[PDB]
Amino acid sequence: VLTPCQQSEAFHKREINEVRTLENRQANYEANSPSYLALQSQIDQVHKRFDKYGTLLCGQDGLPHLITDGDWRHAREFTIPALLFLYITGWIGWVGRSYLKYTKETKNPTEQEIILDVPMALKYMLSGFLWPLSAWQEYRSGQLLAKEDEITVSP
Amino acid sequence: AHTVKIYDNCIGCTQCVRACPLDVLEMVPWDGCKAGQMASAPRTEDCVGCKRCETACPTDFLSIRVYLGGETTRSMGLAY
C-alpha cells in the first residue's frame, strides 16, 4: 500500500537521520569559520527537499514512489516530464533531419557533415520550435516516408 | 583443396592474380570484356584460402569466390 510521505513516519525518520548525519559533522567546526556554514546550507536544503517531496506517495520504506499509470492526479510525476522530453528530443531529431536534407543538396555533403555549416545549422536549429506541426504536412505531402531503399538478397 | 571460382562479371583487371601469393590464379584470353582477358584458377591445389584475391577484386560483388573445403597440407600452410 502507498501513503503520502507527509503522513508516513519513515519519511520523517529519514529526514531526521539526514539532519543528524549533517549535524554530527557540523559540530566539529566553529560557528563563524570556513565550513560549518557549508553544512548549515545543506541542512536547510534537506528541509526544503523533504517539504517538497511530502506531496509524493511512498510505502513502508519511506522512499517516494512515482505512479506512471497515467492518472491525471500524477501527471506532474510522469506525464508532464514525459511530454517535455518528447518535445525536446523531437526538436533535436527534426532539426537534425532537416540539416541532413539540406546538406544532401550541396556539392560535397560529406564535407558539410564533417565541418558543420554553423549558419544553416543554426537556421534549422532556431526553427523547428513547432516540430510536431512540421512533422505533419511532411508526412501528408509524402516527403517524410520513403518508397525504395537498400535491401539485400532475400529482401 | 579450396574451390576458387571465377564468374562472368570479371573485368580482367588482373588484380586478383597480382595479389595471389601462391600462383593459384592466372590470366587467359577472353572475349567478355575489352581487356580480352579473364582470371583463371588452374592451380587451386596450392590455394590456402587467404582470400587476398577476393580483397583485390574491384567488381561490385567479387567475381572470384574462394570456398574453403577439403583441408590438406598445402591449404594449412604447414612448413613442418
Binding site: S98, K123, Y124, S127, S134 | -
Partner: protein, 173 residues
C-alpha cells in the same frame, strides 16, 4: 568604414537603405544569420518591448476595475495572472496573430519576405505614411524601448518600485 565605428568595417550584409542603419555590428551577427530574419527579429522585439513598456507605465495607475487590486510587480503580477488563468488566455490570440500576420510562415526556414520588407506585416489601418523616415523613427523608438523595458524590469527586480515611483527621490543602492 562603418558609420557607428570608424575603426572597424561595415558588415557586408548590412545596407544603408534599410531603416536604422548605423553600421553598428562589431560581432558581425549579420554574418551567419539572414539579414532579413535578423531585421524582422529586431522589429518585433522592439514592438513587443514598446507595448511592454507602456504596460509598466500605465500599470502604476490601475484602470481595470474588473481585475481589482493586483501585485503591480513584474514577477508577482505574472505569477498571479498565470495562476488566475488570464495568462493562458493572453498567450492565445498572440500565437494566432503570429500565424495570421506571417500567413503561416512562422518558422525561420519558412518566413520569406516576398513582396514585403522586414516588419511590413500589414497592420496599417490609418494608411499613414510608411516612408523610410517613419520606419527609422519606428526602429529607433523600438530600440529605445527595448533598453527601457529591460531597465524598468531590472529596477523592479532590485528595488521593487515602479518606474515613475523610482524616478522620484531617487535612492542609491
Amino acid at each position: 568604414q562603418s558609420p557607428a565605428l570608424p575603426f572597424l568595417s561595415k558588415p557586408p550584409n548590412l545596407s544603408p537603405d534599410m531603416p536604422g542603419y548605423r553600421g553598428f555590428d562589431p560581432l558581425r551577427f549579420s554574418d551567419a544569420f539572414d539579414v532579413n530574419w535578423l531585421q524582422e527579429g529586431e522589429i518585433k522585439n522592439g514592438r513587443v518591448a514598446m507595448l511592454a513598456c507602456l504596460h509598466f507605465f500605465v500599470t502604476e495607475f490601475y484602470q481595470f476595475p474588473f481585475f481589482a487590486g493586483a501585485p503591480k510587480l513584474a514577477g508577482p503580477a505574472h505569477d498571479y495572472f498565470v495562476k488566475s488563468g488570464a495568462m493562458i488566455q493572453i498567450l492565445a490570440f498572440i500565437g494566432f496573430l503570429e500565424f495570421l500576420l506571417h500567413r503561416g510562415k512562422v518558422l525561420y526556414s519558412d518566413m520569406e519576405w516576398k513582396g514585403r520588407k522586414p516588419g511590413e506585416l500589414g497592420f496599417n489601418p490609418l494608411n499613414l505614411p510608411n516612408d523610410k523616415a517613419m520606419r527609422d523613427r519606428e526602429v529607433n523608438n523600438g530600440r529605445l524601448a527595448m533598453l527601457g523595458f529591460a531597465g524598468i524590469i531590472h529596477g523592479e527586480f532590485l528595488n521593487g518600485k515602479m518606474p515613475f515611483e523610482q524616478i522620484t527621490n531617487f535612492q542609491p543602492l
